[PDB]
Amino acid sequence: MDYKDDDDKNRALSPMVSEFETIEQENSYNEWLRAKVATSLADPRPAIPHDEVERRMAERFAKMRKERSKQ
C-alpha cells in the first residue's frame, strides 16, 4: 500500500544542466511550470469560478478546512 514514487523523478538522467545539488527543487519548478504553462496561450477549460462555480469550490475548501494531512 504505497504510491507516488514509481516515476517521481522520471528518467532524471541529467535533467538538463542546472543546480545538480537539488533535483527535487528543479522537479518542483518543472512540474508547476509545465502545469501552469498548459493554461498559457490556451483557453480550453480555465477553471475561473465567479459565482456558482466558486461556491462549489468553496465546498471543497470548507471540508478541506477539517483534517489537513493525517499521515
**CATH number for position 38:** 6.20.450.20
Solved using? NMR
Q: How many residues does the chain have?
A: 71
∠ CA(64), CA(59), CA(56), 5° rounding?
140
CA distance 4 to 50: 33
Are 15 and 28 in contact by the 8 Å Cβ rule? The answer is: no
The residue written with cell numbers 459565482 in the block is 51
Contacts of 57 (CB under 8 A, 6+ apart): 49
Range of the structural domain that residue 60 is part of = 1-71
Contacts for 32-36 with beta carbons within 8 Å, 24 or more apart?
A: none
Total domain count for the chain?
1
CA-closest candidate to residue 27, choices 42, 40, 11, 39: 11
The SS3 call for residue 26 is: helix
